[PDB]
Each structure stands twice: as C-alpha cells, then as structure tokens.
C-alpha cells in the first residue's frame, strides 16, 4: 500500500523523463539543507524509494501488476460479501443441538455462553438475545444488521458466525469460540502493553477497518471488551451489534462512552472516521493502561472528548504521540484514515515503520503474548458470571419484527 505515483505527483502512465523530472522537483523541495522542517527528512527518503521503483521498467511493471492484484482481490471480497448479504443464510441450527456449559461474557444486550455441539463435540460461543429486551432497548435494526453483516464478512481477524436461529423467545448467534479471553482482562492485569506489543494488535485492527470500510461497513464499538485473543495470540473482533452498511452518513448515537468520537457526541452525520478515532483511543489505552478521556460520569467523559485536549504519559515515544494527535483529531476532516490517502496515512506513519503488513495479514508474525490453557473446554481466561435459566415461552414473541433473522 504505497502510492509511488502520487508520492512523485504523477499519473500512472507517466514517461521516464516525467518520472525523472518529478523526482528532481520533489527532491529539491525536501532537500535536508534547504528544508529542515519536521519529517522533511522522511519525505526525502520516500521520494527516493518511489523513484527507485518507478524508474526501473522491471520493478515498475511489478508494482503496476501488484496494483491490479489488489483491485482484483477487492473485487472478489465485494462479490463474496454481496452474495452473502443479498441472500442471507437462515435457520442453520437449533437450540437442543448444543449443550450449554458456562457464561463467557455479558454486555448491554446479550449473554454469550460456551456451548458444545452434541453431535460433533465441537465448542462454540453462543450469543443469546431476548427478543422482547431487544425491542425495548430499540435494537431491532441493529440486531438484524449484526447477524446479516457478521455472517457476510470474511477476514482473518473477524470472528466467524457459524450458525444462527431463533425460537419463540430468543435470537441465537453461534460463533467460533475464542478461548484466550478479552484483551480487556489481560490489559487490566498486566497494566499496559509495551509499544511493540500494542502495535501488533493495532496493525490487525488497521487491516480489519481497511477491509470493513472497503465494503462500506462501519463497526462502531471498538474496545478491549470486544476484542478476543485466540490460541495464536492474534485478535478476533466480536460484537457486530452496531455494525452498519453506510454510503454517505449515519446518525445513531451508539458506542461505548470512553470510545465515542466527538462527532457522535455532537449529533453530526458521521462516517467511517469514527472507527479511526476509536483506534486512537484503543492504541492510547493499550500503551498507557488507561483511556485518554475518563471520569466517574459519562457526561464528564463526553465533555473531555469534545474538547479533545489530550495529555500523554512521558513514556510515550515521539512517534506514538504524533500518530495519536492525528487519530484523536477532533476535526474529522483532518483525521488520519479520513484524508485523501485513506488508510495509507496510517500504514506509512513512522510509528508503524517496522510493521510488515502482509506478514500480519498472513498471521506469520510471532505474537507477543500466548494465552495459557488446560483443556478444550477450559475457560479460566474469562471471568465468572452469574448463570441464568434460558426460558422459552410457549407463545411466539415479536414474530414480525425479527422475520428476516
């Protein structure tokens, strides 16, 4: 994801002399003894790298083909999403096929239980939603989106929705079970992650948001509570409860207080930039051990967010602070992720200079942290929750509201 042509200010079909002339022009501009502004040095190097590729016919051809490969990969990803989105899977299991073992986690809307498939012995994580509660909390459209979207996406860091079904009382979403627990509990116990450790997680979220956004999807509930650690130490994003397909802007006030972008708080029509703001909060909390805006009452949290005055621990690197100033940018029109160069302003930021983006995508990087275990059903990486009886009424509830589920 480097834009060599744009770096030199060129069109894709530029000639060799145009490439030479553009490199020379751009070079003079950032030359170390005629430009001593911050990061001019880093641009002087980027212009040289772009020239070395484009000025060599073999390497330029490789780069041009790679641009075509990426476009074709995106076309297949859009195809796969649209086919699944336009004709959603339904009714792919039912309740008494699963032995319910233990509650793994709860949220504002649902209960997630470790279950075991009676026939195969395989373990899964089943999210249970009470239809009447969903209606009361005004989450009908959100819950319909959640299921429809999660089973239509496919990415290495997105949890898989394996089965779904419904009965008189409840909605059920049966996911792959991610056994290493929430990032949240590890982060709180450990205190904070070192910058390379935080960067490892951050890079997975960057690729995941690049993927979702390329399908016109926004996620809207990034937080360590919704991030699970798998057996290889990689991230699995769960909780698509606020995921939505948006071309243009959307208007719902939703999210989790510490992670709300300012434009959501100010009731503005907002877009994919809110996900990039949330990434700033996540990276800050991962590396500091506490979020950039906190207070006892969410009203006071919201007042801090929209001022967006932010202070950094003195142990934060200069590159980390610079990245965070650009992600935690209160003006969405200036926020990294939302500029002309899109996700590349982030991927090519200095703080990510050591990140091998293709190796992260391929899961070839050794994780900084591997969760401990003691068996295929061990749950000790999760807190304990009070257990509650799953009751199914003899009368169907909210039949019309959830017809498409």
């Amino acid at each position: 994801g480097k834009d060599y042509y744009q770096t030199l200010g060129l069109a894709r079909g530029a000639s060799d002399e145009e490439i030479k002339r553009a490199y020379r022009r751009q070079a003079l501009r950032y030359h170390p003894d005629k430009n001593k502004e911050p990061g001019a040095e880093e641009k002087f190097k980027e212009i040289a790298e772009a020239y070395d590729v484009l000025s060599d016919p073999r390497k330029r051809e490789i780069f041009d083909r790679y641009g075509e490969e990426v476009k074709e990969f995106l076309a297949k990803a859009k195809e796969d999403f649209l086919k699944k989105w336009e004709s959603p899977a339904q009714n792919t299991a039912h309740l008494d096929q699963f032995e319910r073992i233990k509650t793994l986690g709860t949220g504002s809307f649902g209960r997630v239980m470790l279950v075991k498939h009676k026939e195969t012995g395989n373990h899964y994580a089943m999210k249970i939603l009470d239809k009447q509660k969903v209606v009361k909390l005004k989450q009908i459209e959100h819950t319909l989106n959640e299921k429809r979207i999660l089973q239509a996406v496919n990415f290495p860091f997105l949890v898989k929705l394996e089965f779904s079904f419904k009965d008189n009382s409840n909605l059920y979403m049966v996911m792959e079970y991610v056994p290493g627990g929430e990032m949240f509990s590890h982060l709180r116990r450990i205190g904070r992650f070192s910058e390379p450790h935080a960067r490892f997680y951050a890079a997975q979220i960057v690729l995941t948001f690049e993927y979702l956004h390329s399908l016109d999807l926004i996620y809207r509930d990034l937080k360590p509570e919704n991030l699970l650690i798998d057996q290889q130490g990689y991230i699995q994003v769960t909780d698509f409860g606020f995921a939505k397909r948006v071309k243009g802007r959307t208007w719902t006030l939703c999210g989790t207080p510490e992670y709300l972008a300012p434009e959501i708080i100010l009731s503005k029509g907002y877009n994919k930039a809110v996900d990039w703001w949330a990434l700033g909060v996540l990276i800050y909390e991962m590396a500091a051990g506490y979020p950039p805006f906190f207070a006892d009452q969410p009203i006071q949290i919201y007042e801090k967010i929209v001022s967006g005055k932010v202070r950094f621990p003195s142990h934060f690197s200069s590159d980390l602070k610079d990245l965070l100033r650009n992600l935690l940018q209160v003006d969405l029109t200036k926020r990294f992720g939302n500029l002309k160069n899109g996700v590349n302003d982030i991927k090519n930021h200095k703080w990510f200079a050591t990140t091998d983006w293709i190796a992260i995508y391929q899961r070839k990087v050794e994780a900084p942290f591997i969760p401990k275990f003691k068996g295929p059903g061990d749950t000790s990486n999760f807190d304990d929750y009070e257990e509650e009886e799953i009751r199914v009424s003899i009368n169907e509830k909210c039949g019309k509201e959830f017809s498409e589920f």
Binding site: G107, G241, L253, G255, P257, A288, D296
Partner: peptide, 20 residues
C-alpha cells in the same frame, strides 16, 4: 500519577455499550 488515579477510579471494570 494518572495511572494511579485511574486504578483508584470508578470505571476500571468492563464497560458495556450505551443503550441510551
């Protein structure tokens, strides 16, 4: 210190989404 203030604060536990 700020981390000290945070771990002695009221919002160190899991944060559920807003239902508003």
């Amino acid at each position: 210190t700020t981390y000290a203030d945070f771990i002695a604060s009221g919002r160190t536990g899991r944060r559920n989404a807003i239902h508003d």
